[PDB]
Every structure is written in C-alpha cells, then in structure tokens.
Amino acid sequence: ATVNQLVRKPRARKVAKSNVPALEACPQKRGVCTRVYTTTPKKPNSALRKVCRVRLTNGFEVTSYIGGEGHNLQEHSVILIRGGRVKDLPGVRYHTVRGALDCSGVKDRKQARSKYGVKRPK
Amino acid sequence: SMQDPIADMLTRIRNGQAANKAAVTMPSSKLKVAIANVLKEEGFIEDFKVEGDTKPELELTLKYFQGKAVVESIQRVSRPGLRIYKRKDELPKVMAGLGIAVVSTSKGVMTDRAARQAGLGGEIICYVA
RNA sequence: GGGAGAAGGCACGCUGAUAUGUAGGUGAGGUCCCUCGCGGAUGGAGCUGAAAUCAGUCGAAGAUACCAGCUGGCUGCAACUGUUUAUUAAAAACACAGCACUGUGCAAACACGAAAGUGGACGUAUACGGUGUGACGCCUGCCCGGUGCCGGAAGGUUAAU
RNA sequence: UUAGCUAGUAGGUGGGGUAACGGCUCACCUAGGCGACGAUCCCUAGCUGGUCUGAGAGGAUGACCAGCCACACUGGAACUGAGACACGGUCCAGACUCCUACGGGAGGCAGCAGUGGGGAAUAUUGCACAAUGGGCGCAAGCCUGAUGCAGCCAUGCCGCGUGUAUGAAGAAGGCCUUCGGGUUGUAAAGUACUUUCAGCGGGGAGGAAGGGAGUAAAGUUAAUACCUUUGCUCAUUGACGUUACCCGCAGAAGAAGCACCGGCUAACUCCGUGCCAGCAGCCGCGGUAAUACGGAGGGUGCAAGCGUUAAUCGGAAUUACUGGGCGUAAAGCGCACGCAGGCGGUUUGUUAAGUCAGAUGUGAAAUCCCCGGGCUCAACCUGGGAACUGCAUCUGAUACUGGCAAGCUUGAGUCUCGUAGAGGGGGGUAGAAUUCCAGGUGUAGCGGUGAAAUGCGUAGAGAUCUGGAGGAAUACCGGUGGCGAAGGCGGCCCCCUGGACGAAGACUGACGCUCAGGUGCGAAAGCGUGGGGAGCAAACAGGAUUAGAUACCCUGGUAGUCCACGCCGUAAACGAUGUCGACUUGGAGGUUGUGCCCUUGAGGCGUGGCUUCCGGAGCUAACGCGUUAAGUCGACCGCCUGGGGAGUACGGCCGCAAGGUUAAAACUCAAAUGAAUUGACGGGGGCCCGCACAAGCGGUGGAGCAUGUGGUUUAAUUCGAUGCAA
RNA sequence: AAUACGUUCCCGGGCCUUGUACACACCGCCCGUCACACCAUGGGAGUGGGUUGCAAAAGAAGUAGGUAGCUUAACCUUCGGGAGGGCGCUUACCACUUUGUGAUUCAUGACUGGGGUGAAGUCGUAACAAGGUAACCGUAGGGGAACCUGCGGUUGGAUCA
Numbered sequence A: 001a002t003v004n005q006l007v008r009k010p011r012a013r014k015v016a017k018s019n020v021p022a023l024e025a026c027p028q029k030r031g032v033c034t035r036v037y038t039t040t041p042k043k044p045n046s047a048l049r050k051v052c053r054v055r056l057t058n059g060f061e062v063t064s065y066i067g068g069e070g071h072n073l074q075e076h077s078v079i080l081i082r083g084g085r086v087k088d089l090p091g092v093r094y095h096t097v098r099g100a101l102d103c104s105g106v107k108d109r110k111q112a113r114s115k116y117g118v119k120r121p122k
Numbered sequence B: 001s002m003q004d005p006i007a008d009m010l011t012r013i014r015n016g017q018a019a020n021k022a023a024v025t026m027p028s029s030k031l032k033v034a035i036a037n038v039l040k041e042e043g044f045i046e047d048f049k050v051e052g053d054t055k056p057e058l059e060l061t062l063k064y065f066q067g068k069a070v071v072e073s074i075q076r077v078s079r080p081g082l083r084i085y086k087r088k089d090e091l092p093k094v095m096a097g098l099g100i101a102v103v104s105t106s107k108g109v110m111t112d113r114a115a116r117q118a119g120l121g122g123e124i125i126c127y128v129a
Numbered sequence C: 001g002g003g004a005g006a007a008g009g010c011a012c013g014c015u016g017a018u019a020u021g022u023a024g025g026u027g028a029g030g031u032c033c034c035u036c037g038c039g040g041a042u043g044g045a046g047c048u049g050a051a052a053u054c055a056g057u058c059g060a061a062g063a064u065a066c067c068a069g070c071u072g073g074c075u076g077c078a079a080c081u082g083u084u085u086a087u088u089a090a091a092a093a094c095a096c097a098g099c100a101c102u103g104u105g106c107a108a109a110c111a112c113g114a115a116a117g118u119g120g121a122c123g124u125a126u127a128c129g130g131u132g133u134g135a136c137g138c139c140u141g142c143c144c145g146g147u148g149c150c151g152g153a154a155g156g157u158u159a160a161u
Numbered sequence D: 001u002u003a004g005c006u007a008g009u010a011g012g013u014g015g016g017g018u019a020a021c022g023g024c025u026c027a028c029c030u031a032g033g034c035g036a037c038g039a040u041c042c043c044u045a046g047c048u049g050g051u052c053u054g055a056g057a058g059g060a061u062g063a064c065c066a067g068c069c070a071c072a073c074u075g076g077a078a079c080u081g082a083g084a085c086a087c088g089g090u091c092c093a094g095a096c097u098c099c100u101a102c103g104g105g106a107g108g109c110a111g112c113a114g115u116g117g118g119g120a121a122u123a124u125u126g127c128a129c130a131a132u133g134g135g136c137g138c139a140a141g142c143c144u145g146a147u148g149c150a151g152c153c154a155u156g157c158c159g160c161g162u163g164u165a166u167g168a169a170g171a172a173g174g175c176c177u178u179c180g181g182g183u184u185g186u187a188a189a190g191u192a193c194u195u196u197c198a199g200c201g202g203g204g205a206g207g208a209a210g211g212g213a214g215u216a217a218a219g220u221u222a223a224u225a226c227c228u229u230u231g232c233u234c235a236u237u238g239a240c241g242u243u244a245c246c247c248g249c250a251g252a253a254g255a256a257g258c259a260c261c262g263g264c265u266a267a268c269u270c271c272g273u274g275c276c277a278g279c280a281g282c283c284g285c286g287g288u289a290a291u292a293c294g295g296a297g298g299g300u301g302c303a304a305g306c307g308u309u310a311a312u313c314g315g316a317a318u319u320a321c322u323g324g325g326c327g328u329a330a331a332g333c334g335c336a337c338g339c340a341g342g343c344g345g346u347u348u349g350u351u352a353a354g355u356c357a358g359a360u361g362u363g364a365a366a367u368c369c370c371c372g373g374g375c376u377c378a379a380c381c382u383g384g385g386a387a388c389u390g391c392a393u394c395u396g397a398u399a400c401u402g403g404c405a406a407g408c409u410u411g412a413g414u415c416u417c418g419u420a421g422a423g424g425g426g427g428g429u430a431g432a433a434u435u436c437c438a439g440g441u442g443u444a445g446c447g448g449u450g451a452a453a454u455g456c457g458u459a460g461a462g463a464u465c466u467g468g469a470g471g472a473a474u475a476c477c478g479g480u481g482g483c484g485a486a487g488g489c490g491g492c493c494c495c496c497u498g499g500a501c502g503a504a505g506a507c508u509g510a511c512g513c514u515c516a517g518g519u520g521c522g523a524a525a526g527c528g529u530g531g532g533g534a535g536c537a538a539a540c541a542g543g544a545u546u547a548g549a550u551a552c553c554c555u556g557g558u559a560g561u562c563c564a565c566g567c568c569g570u571a572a573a574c575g576a577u578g579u580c581g582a583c584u585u586g587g588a589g590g591u592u593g594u595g596c597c598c599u600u601g602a603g604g605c606g607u608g609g610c611u612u613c614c615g616g617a618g619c620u621a622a623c624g625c626g627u628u629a630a631g632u633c634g635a636c637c638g639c640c641u642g643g644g645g646a647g648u649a650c651g652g653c654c655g656c657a658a659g660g661u662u663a664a665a666a667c668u669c670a671a672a673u674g675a676a677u678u679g680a681c682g683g684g685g686g687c688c689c690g691c692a693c694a695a696g697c698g699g700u701g702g703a704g705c706a707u708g709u710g711g712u713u714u715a716a717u718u719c720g721a722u723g724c725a726a
Numbered sequence E: 001a002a003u004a005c006g007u008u009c010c011c012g013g014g015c016c017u018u019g020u021a022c023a024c025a026c027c028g029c030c031c032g033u034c035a036c037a038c039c040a041u042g043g044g045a046g047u048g049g050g051u052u053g054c055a056a057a058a059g060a061a062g063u064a065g066g067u068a069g070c071u072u073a074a075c076c077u078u079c080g081g082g083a084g085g086g087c088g089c090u091u092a093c094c095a096c097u098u099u100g101u102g103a104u105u106c107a108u109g110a111c112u113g114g115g116g117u118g119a120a121g122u123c124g125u126a127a128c129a130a131g132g133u134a135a136c137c138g139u140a141g142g143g144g145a146a147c148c149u150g151c152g153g154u155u156g157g158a159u160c161a
C-alpha cells in the first residue's frame, strides 16, 4: 500500500509448486512397471483408458497413461516416463514414452510416428 | 492535520479549475509565492497578489481558454512521505515537452527548461500539464 | 508449590608459599572525655581461625574406620499427613478438608435420665445434629410403577366414650 | 510456527606469542557485549564480472571463460620451505583394497585418458613440445595429459548443397465430384545448360619467431685473448598436414525429413469405426455425415533438422517502488489511549547531513552497444570509443528536507459565562401490571388451537372484592429525537463525575496527526463464589399435525434472564465505509445556542455544533456515494493475491473450563464470485376476462342395450392415436 | 324455460410491481450423516535412523614447559671436564573412541478423528419465493443427518396500516 509499510514488509512472491514432483525437475525418468491395468475416466466422457502404476528409480511410485493402441508392456517391464498429465483422468501426472527400452511402438502407424516411436516405412 | 501546504495549494487550484472559480484565495507562504511565480510565467494562471500583514493570503486568479481550463493535470510528484531528487540529466519531461515539472534547485524554483539550460538538477515538486 | 537429592558428572590425604596463620569474631595496654564509671571516638599486643588457588609428595584405593539414598519407565487403587483388628490380616479398610440433603426459632432438634437435671450451649440458622460421597478439573443425564417422607381432608372404614 | 544469546564472553593493567595490530594467550580487576535496524538457532547455498528473459524497473541463475575462497579417502597435527599446516610431501587414528614366511608392510584419479556402478544422458587408455608460457640450467639442452592440436556426438550458432532455364500431349496413376469436372501440376517425362559440396590427381602459402657455425664494427683489458651487443653468408625447424586455398576429370549423380490442419494459430475433403477403439495445453470431441479418433488425398510451418518433455523470464498490472484494491468479488482491526517509529503550520539567521554542480582516484580483464578491420559472407576474432547506472575525497551552490538559536498565531490546549442531553457510578422513593398467600360472594366450567387433547375443575376451578408477600421493567411523553470512542443508555429524586457547543475577552506558542508491540473498555451467550427468583424461557415431561416430526403449535417446566465481586473476549461488534486537515454546485427539514430588527403568531435577516432525505459535477463493473463523498489530495496503521481443504491441525500464549488468539501443509477443481438485464416461478401483492365458480336446468357414475381402449386367450385378434389436445 | 346478489373461491388466461442461489427454466435447484472404492492427512501405546546441545571419561602422533637417568663432533678448557644438544620420562593442548540425559527431523505403527473424487445406492428436504417456522452472526444445550430451541444484534427479508 505505502512505501513505509513495504520497507518493513517486502512484497513477497507467490511461488507455486510444480505439477510433476516425482520427476524432480527432470525431462525423463526410468521406471519398472508394477501394476498395468485399465481405468475409467470421470463423468463428462466414458471410455477405458490404459494406465500403469510404476515405481520410479528415485523411489517415487506414480501412475502413467499408455498412449496409442497396443502395448506389449506388462509387469517387470522397464519403461521411460516423461511429464504431461491427462485431463480426464484423476491421479495421473505423467506419460509413458513409446520407443523406450522396452515400450514398443504402435503398429502400422503412419502419422506422428515420432510421438509413438515408429520406424519410418520403406 | 495540514502536513503539505504545497499539496493543499495544488488541491485548491485544481478544485477551482474544476468548479470554474474565478480566483482561489488561501493562506500563502514563501514557497507558495515561488511556485505561483513559475505558474504565472508560463501562462497557467492569470495573476496573483499577496494580501495581508500578519497572515498573508495568496489570491490566485485562474485562466479559462474557450471555456475549458488551461491547466489539464497538476500532480504532486514529491510528497512528504517519499522525497524524489533527480540530477540535471534525469529531469522528467511532461507530455514530451508540452508540460512542465517545477523543480526547486540551488538557484531557486525554476522549470525543466531553465534547469537544463543552467546545467544543474534539484528535487522535483509537481507536474503541470 | 512440585517431580528434584531427577538422571548423570569433577575435587576431597599430607606438606610448603599466598598469610613463618588471610578473611571474620573476641579483643588489653596508650590519648580527649564525662550528666565520672560496669562509659564512649582511635588503638589491634595477643590466642582462636574457616575457603580456595599454585607446586611438590606417598599408597592399587584420601566421604580410606563407624555412621552413611539403588536408580528410571509403564500402570490400578486411594487425593495426601494419619488410624485400624494388643497377640497370624496396616491394606484398596476408617477418618479427612470439600460437596449435597434433611430437621432444628431456643424451654430448639437429639441423647443420657421412671423424674429432677445435664450435654448440646453459658452457642442462636454464616449455629447444631443426622445421613450420603470424600483434595482438585468436566458433570450428577431419564423414571414416583413399588416402599419410605411431606402437603390435603372432598368421599369410605374406624378405637376408647 | 527460531526471542533471548554470550563468562575468554565486553573492556582495562601487566607478562607471553606472531613478520605485523589484536583475549591470539595467560594472571588479576571491572559486569559488561550483542538484540524487533532480527541477537541465538534450523534448512539451503561457493561469491563476483557475468548469462537468460524482460522496453524499463525487476525476476531467475553461477553452463564456458576470468578474479577470489575452500578442498585433495575422513579427521587431527607439525616440520622443511621467503612463500603450505602442502593433490602426485611427513606423522598418527578409522574404513576400504592388496602382498606375506604371520613377525610384519604398501595406496589414495573431486589431474589427463580410461575402468566398475548411478543416471535420461557427458568423449579416445590419440600426436607434439614446432609456437605461446612454466620449472631447471650462463648457454646448448631436458620436463611439461597446461598448452598447441587430432577423434566422436546435429549439443548450440553460422553458411552452402541436395540442380537451373525450358517443358500443356494440363501425360499416366491417385483425391474427391453434382460424373460434365477440378486437385496433384511445370509437378512429372523430354530438351538445353552449370559441377558449388562428396571423390580422384597435381600445385601450394601462413601459424617461424628463434638456435647453432663463421665474418666486419663497438664496449673491455696488457692485449689482436675470452665474453656481450650490433649487421652480414651458408646450414637450418611444424604434431597439426593427404593443411587453408587454387587448378584439370567426368557425370544431375551421392545427398530431405519432421510437426500440424475445430477456436486460440497458418492450413479441408473422403475412407474405417460408432462415448468402443482413441486425441488433448485450455475450451472439449467419438452414441453411423467426426474438417477434433486411425488412414488416404490435399494444404501450412520449419529445415538437417522437426516435435515432446524439464527449468527460467514475459504475457501475469496475477506481490503492482515504476504499476492494484479494501461498501457489496478477497480485503477497515469492535472501539479508544499510547511507547519506539513515520510525518509535520509560519519568519529570520546559522550549519551544510541528504539533495544539486565541477574535478580526482577507482569501478580488472572479459561481456553488451557504436564506429572500422580480418577470416571468400556469416558465426568467430579484433582496434578504438562509450558504458560499468556504484563508492571515497576535494572545491562550491542554499531553493527544499534535515540539525541549531531566536520569533508569530491561523494548528492545538486552557481560563471566564451560560445551554441541552436514556453519558457513567452509588443510594432512596411511587404507581400500572403479572404471580402466590389468607378471607368473602359465587356455580360447572376455565385454559388452549385451523380443530382437538395433555393441563386446571365439585377438595369449589375461572370471575369478582379486600388485605398481605416478593421479583423485573418503568404505559402516554417517544421522534430516521438526544448523549456516548464503541458496546450501550428511557419513571422520579439526591450525591460524585466525564464529555460536547456558543456570544466577547487575553496568553502558552507547534506543545500538532497517526501508530507495529503494550494497556484499557468492550452486546449477548458462558463459567466460579454468596444471594435472589414474579413473569419469560434452553435442556426436559405430556398433548397435537404428519408416513416419520428428537421441530414449528399447545400445557408445564430447570439452568439462565436479576444483584455483588470475579473469569472469556466472542457478534451481521454494520454505515460490511480505519483517525485528522483543507479544498468542490443546491433544495427540503430535525435538534441545540447566539446578534439585530416595531418579537402584534412557532415575525425575518445572519452565524455556529449534530443529524435525515433528495440531487448536480465528479467517481464506480453497476447498485449507488455525492460538503457527514464511495469527488481531487496529503500523514499514518491494518488487511487482501482463486474456490474448497480451514481460520482446520500442529506449534507458542491467554483462559478453571467452554474456547480465544498467531497460523499452515499435502490433495481436488475449472471455476468460485457481486451489480444489472430478459424470461420463468412464489403456499407475494394489485387489476381484469372466460359457464371457471355462485343462482339454475338436464344428464353421466345405477341395469341390460350400440361402440372404442387396456389386459386376458388364440395363429391372428392387422397398424397407428395413449393427459386436458387418446 | 329458469337464473346470473358479486368475484369471496376451484380452473385456464391477460398487464404492472416485487424476490430469486431456476434458465430443457420449481417435474427447477440442492444440502449432511450413513454404506463401498481410492487418495492425501492429524492423533496414536511404541519402533528404527540422521543431525545436534549439555556434563564427563579418553590420551595415537604432533607442539611448548620440567629433568632423580641415558649419552655426547663443532664452543670453552686449568685438559679432569664444563657449556650446550639428543634419547627416555613427565606435565599442558588436541584427534579416534566411550558414558549419561535432552532438542530437532525422517520413516514406520495396531487403532482412531477429520477432508477430497467417485459410478440411476439408502434416509430426509435445511438454504434459494413470505422455500411454506426468514434466513444469517456470536454463544449454550439437544438430536441419525441436514438442523431445532433460548439469549443479544443486521436486513445481505416478502406483503400491509
């Protein structure tokens, strides 16, 4: 309000925590699948999403979301996890990146093959 | 409590201009007379005359051009809660030169152009536009 | 207020300097004095005399003998100090301050007394007696069907006469 | 939500010690020192020039390079040494690893490489001292994993190429289509012309200055010996290096992918599914026409790069010093006093601390910017300039602020006289009224509700009259009236006292405003003690409605409401508007003074204090505020930064307790909000109409008869209409 | 034929105003216990660590002081030795380590309190109209739940003299 008040109490910031705590400011983290299954979204739209509870290397255990159709991953599978959450699924804050150590890419993919780790067709 | 006679004078003249007052009488002071001299030397006011022996009063007469008031905005910059001092090369420029910023300096209470020509700063008082 | 001496730790003998015995207490002889002797102002010759530092020294051990707390935590009961079955039970058993109810207007209730009389009390409802629980913090929630107690005598029964 | 810390601790005398001053150390004496301008403690963190972002102020950050500090398996120590308590030095203790004859010993890659684990990820056990430097040496000469360079990685920046000019049979195929068409498209094929880059073969700078061997001259001495220096001639020297670069060969070959296409944002049509498969940063899509999913065609962006992820800045004026608000969205402490602090009426003189001018030193180099140069351009390098917004000193300026000394009354406070007031505390007094006690008259009801009953009644209720007992508040006056900082205050009288205003008069002379801590007051409810208790009334008992009604209603009824002393400090403590100063049009009042006029009426003309309503300018998102501003300012304090979680838990304090105060974090959400607008609704109001009721008349529902519907049965009882409107 | 006093009332409709938390628009909205799943938290008898405070024990090497011994290249000697030095021992400082008791933080802990998101769940309708008891604020009591009652204050309440 006034300079006399502001010199006594400096204008503090409004720092907000990140939405990806388990990454610890890291683009990618390697984890091992623990519980691969299917869940249902919330009220606005009904579907059957594919999710996986995975224990990260540092110690955190999170729930990712498998992208695309077709995933050969299962329990005890090494996967790579990046940021980005799913709006219509509560709890998920990360995405499993395809083309990883064991996460195979989507079969017969022609468009946006890089986002799903698909070799360029001949 | 009255803690800023210059701000009181600025408020009085602004209210007089807003309400279309011919002249605004008020208690005066040496700094008030010095500021009124600068205001009259720039055509912002008609004239002024100190009246009184023990309690001098300034009687500033406003100027109206085509109905609308000549002075647009008079803003007290350096208030007695935050003093503002500017060097010769850091003086402000109201409306890119169309307005004035009264500055009290070692040689007296002059304007931006006078201070820049003389080559010395001072502390600002108010912007008149 | 306490727990608390919580728990747990270091010194303790002897000799020498400090001081050939310090501080402190007691405390004479010399000098003014008097409203003059069992008197006051200075005065420390003395004997007494802790407590600590410094250094040295002897033994395995210096509160070296006798005397002379084991400690802490988790819990039930009782508030605590006391009293209790002399002579197998000392306690959770009684008492306790605090609290509640009840009766008691003085020639008071009650108790001892065939009665006088006394205690209550040479007190007067902030007093006395009895009955319950028993320091203190939160509370004493519902019910008079039954037995006691009180208020009423409208109706029924009812002794002696 | 870390408030007290410090006893070698602060100072002093003397001694000792360091190269140097110093409790650095010792013995003694003093009881001091730090601290709301944050002492002590916890977590985190190498610092700076700098870098990113930002117009700026700012925010983030410490990659490379450069300056400083610390470290060398961990800890402690000392010696040599001018320089260390020392990376490849010493000693000791602990772990690890290794050899052993079991007695005993060896080592510290957070150096260059490289190995093993961690990770999402970080390079080859490469060449050379040829140059720039270092160490040794008079020199020659040796070392140099610094350095000069080579290798890998698109990790970042810059440049180039992946051909160009023709080329409409608008080739063929694909895409969709209205089957006529257009799209791919000069795109392709074909013709002509170049060879940058990659490859082959030759030529070939610069990074090279230095050094040795002789010769002429100068300085030297006794000397033409020996040395140094100056010129001259031949030897000489490169890891990079198949160097940069230039030239000839031939062939258009060897060289383009990624992301997106519903809005934000530049790009649309079909095919495959059908809230399934799936997309997503938000809004959200898919339930058979998906420009949103997957593919195809087409289009857009970038380009040896393209998207995702993680972090920073901007947008975010969304911590607002530049640059916000607090009546209603979040935001005025319930109010008052007041310490530190913040600010401060008016004149003179003085000081010149801030401020303003000039000069000096410094603000490293590096980096940014400006003007030029070199690399074929650029990246990159480089010369000069500017800048480094800062600090210290000197010489002046005196308007402002600040310090000092004198003045003044306009701010403020006081006297003298009246005025009004439910202002506060204490003590008395008088009636209305309610409830009980006693008595008299009096008989079958009283009370209550939409209606009923619980309840009171033949033991005489209710009613009436008399006397008595006790509690609370004082009908009319009584009002948008008054007082008080707020809460709050209502019969009358007395006692003590606070506050406000006005007529005229003089001094005191800035004594003035606000206020973090702190203190005090503080509705009602609540608790403790000792009383009181008429009425009312939580809890509770009974009756009643209702499916249920632990409520609204009725009959009783305890705490409480009352008194005195104590405790909490909560409210919609509201004008949802913190205190003061002055300025800025008016009307109608209310209350209370005061001056003068013929006061013939509450006649008029002025001036003050409080307060109500309307309203102009102005302000606000609007409602609304509007001289008592929510209009323009000045001084100060408090508070707000999305809704929940929550004013919740923990923690400190207060409190007998109830609870109060200070006050978070994890997690979820795309909103949560206020003023107003148009509908709709109200067991809201006002007005009006219609056989809609009221006054009729006749029928329907009763018992067969003619029809349609529902269900039943069948092979069908064919299908549709399924409230008024079948 | 009869009857129509008047809109008091049922139904449907027309206009103005008022309040609204409704806008597929009251067949609207919407609250909290209770059950089930998941998630993040406080309490929790205790459990295992990190860091660290206080009071002590502890004496490897290494520094400085002291000398009952052991010895001795430089100097001096009066030729025996002396001065001085080293070794050993001891004292002072200190590291590893050890004992007792506290503070902070992390994880865990049977059980338990509150919170959030959930799928045609069960129970009722408290707030939004005069929401049909007008809600809200402070407080005390009571109840399965929203909530009810008494006390003090506000209209951020609708009609009417």
Ligand SMILES: [Mg+2]
Binding pocket: none
């Ligand atoms: Mg003595």
Ligand SMILES: [Mg+2]
Binding pocket: none
């Ligand atoms: Mg037991």
Ligand SMILES: [Mg+2]
Binding pocket: C078
């Ligand atoms: Mg006992």
Ligand SMILES: [Mg+2]
Binding pocket: none
């Ligand atoms: Mg007990």
Ligand SMILES: [Mg+2]
Binding pocket: C082
């Ligand atoms: Mg005992």
Ligand SMILES: [Mg+2]
Binding pocket: none
């Ligand atoms: Mg016994």
Ligand SMILES: [Mg+2]
Binding pocket: none
């Ligand atoms: Mg007697």
Ligand SMILES: [Mg+2]
Binding pocket: none
């Ligand atoms: Mg007992």
Ligand SMILES: [Mg+2]
Binding pocket: none
């Ligand atoms: Mg008790």
Ligand SMILES: [Mg+2]
Binding pocket: C140
């Ligand atoms: Mg009982």
Ligand SMILES: [Mg+2]
Binding pocket: C144
């Ligand atoms: Mg009875």
Ligand SMILES: [Mg+2]
Binding pocket: none
């Ligand atoms: Mg009886």
Ligand SMILES: [Mg+2]
Binding pocket: none
């Ligand atoms: Mg000294």
Ligand SMILES: [Mg+2]
Binding pocket: D054, D314
């Ligand atoms: Mg910006």
Ligand SMILES: [Mg+2]
Binding pocket: none
């Ligand atoms: Mg660094």
Ligand SMILES: [Mg+2]
Binding pocket: D088, D109
């Ligand atoms: Mg090494």
